[PDB]
Design a protein around this ligand. Structure first.
Ligand SMILES: [Cl-]
Ligand SMILES: [Mg+2]
Ligand code: NA
Length: 174
DNA sequence: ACTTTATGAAAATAAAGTATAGTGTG
């Protein structure tokens, strides 16, 4: 099985539909009655160095999907499946910051379990997805995250180095 | 490399916006 880790950028106006999608169990200590957009805006406002307002097209967070193939999870019981997602959340907390993980919500139902984890790209007083998740950082995640998971006893191959596959969705795959 | 944004105000500037790297299923 391959580790599946991929991100999507979320602006204010994407965060609303994702909060509703995800009411599922939530691994962070977030207050489950405050919206993603309000939680992240308070946090950035309360900490950013700059006195300018957050730009209207800011990436407020990088939503990572973490999962693998169906048969990988058939091999795990529910305790071990939960620890798989907690272990993955630990990797991103240690490398990007504890207080940046705004949500880590796991779907555990009809399909293969998938976690949607919102990582705020706030480093050094500055909100910038561009600075945190650049081409080199993404290469490094595809190499290093599967190695970390294997060290915790979850046997995962890294994705094909320089893979030429394109991201597909069900509608487009038809 | 190029464009959009926020700024006590630009006939202008800097910081962050645009993808990125990766597989799933049947
Ligand atoms: Cl928006
Ligand atoms: Mg299972
Ligand atoms: Na240029």
């Amino acid at each position: 099985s391959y580790m599946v880790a991929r991100m999507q950028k979320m602006k204010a106006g994407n965060l609303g539909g994702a909060f509703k999608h995800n009411e599922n169990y939530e691994l962070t200590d977030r207050d489950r009655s405050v919206s993603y957009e309000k939680q992240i805006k308070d946090y950035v406002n309360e900490n950013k160095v700059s006195n300018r307002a957050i730009r209207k097209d800011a990436v407020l967070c990088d939503e990572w999907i973490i999962t693998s193939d169906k048969d990988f999870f058939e091999k795990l019981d529910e305790e071990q499946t939960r620890t798989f997602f907690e272990t993955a959340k630990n990797y991103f907390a240690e490398n990007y910051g504890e207080s940046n993980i705004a949500y880590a919500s796991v779907h555990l139902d009809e399909s293969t379990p998938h976690m949607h984890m919102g990582v705020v790209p706030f480093e050094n007083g500055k909100l910038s997805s561009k600075a945190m998740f650049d081409r080199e950082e993404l290469k490094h995640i595809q190499e290093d995250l599967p190695r970390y998971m294997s060290d915790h006893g979850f046997e995962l191959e890294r994705g094909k180095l320089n893979s030429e596959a394109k991201h597909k969705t069900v509608a487009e795959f038809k």
